[PDB]
From a paper:
Here, by applying cryo-electron tomography (cryo-ET) and subtomogram averaging (StA) on GBP1-coated liposomes and single particle analysis (SPA) on self-polymerized GBP1, we report an outstretched, dimeric conformation of GBP1 oligomerized on a lipid surface and in its polymeric state in solution. The GDP•AlFx-bound GBP1 coatomer was well recognizable in cryo-ET volumes of BPL liposomes. The protein coat had an average height of 28.3 nm ± 1.6 nm, which agrees well with the theoretical dimension of a dimeric, outstretched GBP1 dimer (~28.8 nm). We further performed subtomogram averaging which resulted in a map of membrane-bound GBP1 dimers at a moderate resolution of ~26 Å. Although the map did not allow for a detailed molecular fitting of the GBP1 dimer, it suggested the potential oligomerization interfaces: the MD and GED were apparently not involved in higher order assembly, based on the absence of density between these elements outside the dimer. In contrast, the dimeric LG domains displayed lateral contacts mediating the formation of a two-dimensional protein lattice. Within the coatomer, the overall shapes of the LG domain and MD match well with the recently published crystal structure of the GBP5 dimer and the cryo-EM structure of the GBP1 dimer, suggesting that the coatomer is comprised of dimeric building blocks with crisscrossed MDs that are extended by elongated GEDs. The GEDs extend in parallel toward the membrane surface, allowing the C-terminal farnesyl moiety to insert into the lipid bilayer. We show that the peripheral helix α4’ in the LG domain is critical for establishing the oligomeric interface and facilitates the formation of an antimicrobial protein coat. The farnesyl moiety can insert into the membrane, while helix α4’ is available to form a stable oligomeric interface via the LG domains.
Numbering used by the authors:
A (entry chain A): 342 to 492
B (entry chain B): 443 to 492
Write the structure that this text describes.
């Protein structure tokens, strides 16, 4: 029943709780005279350990899928920056518009899972320095054009 | 700063991989600084020529 990444943590937890209850019913039907409920505690500990593993694997699968998807979506933009496409007057504004359009595209893609926002924010924060460098280049070029026109 | 990072002990087995991943994340910043430098250097050259 579990296909990773799951869209919500809640769906994964509900699937775990249902499967956990059925596993407890299987144990109750095949157990007797469990002194101090030792075997039942062992089963509960094993089920908790599996809940933690599957939640961690879901976080990893979601992170990896979102990281690959951001590389796919924003790889053209990164190459366009390297080629100097935004190194012109008003080029920062074009970069910001294109960045917003690509964020909108990333939101539309399905099966991102629980790390969708966190991975995107981590990615956007990693590109702030690139944004600022484009802004400084735009301002410097715009000032140079203004001086050329004044002269 | 890379030389400083290499000098620090107790980095463990992911030392190179984490550094390469970090340096690759800053390529865009490097390129933006380069474009800004070139644009400013050209503007200074035009100002001197004028």
């Amino acid at each position: 029943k579990v296909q990773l990444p799951t869209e919500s943590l809640q769906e994964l937890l509900d699937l775990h709780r249902d499967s956990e209850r059925e596993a407890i019913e299987v144990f109750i039907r095949s157990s007797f005279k469990d002194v101090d409920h030792l075997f039942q505690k062992e089963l509960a500990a094993q089920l908790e350990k599996k809940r933690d593993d599957f939640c961690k694997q879901n976080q990893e699968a979601s992170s990896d899928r979102c990281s690959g998807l951001l590389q796919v979506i924003f790889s053209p933009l990164e190459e366009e920056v390297k080629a100097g496409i935004y190194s012109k007057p008003g080029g920062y504004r074009l970069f910001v518009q294109k960045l917003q359009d690509l964020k909108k595209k990333y939101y539309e893609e399905p099966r991102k899972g629980i790390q969708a926002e966190e991975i995107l924010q981590t990615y956007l924060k990693s590109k702030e320095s690139m944004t600022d460098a484009i802004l400084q280049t735009d301002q410097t070029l715009t000032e140079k054009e203004k001086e050329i026109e004044v002269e």
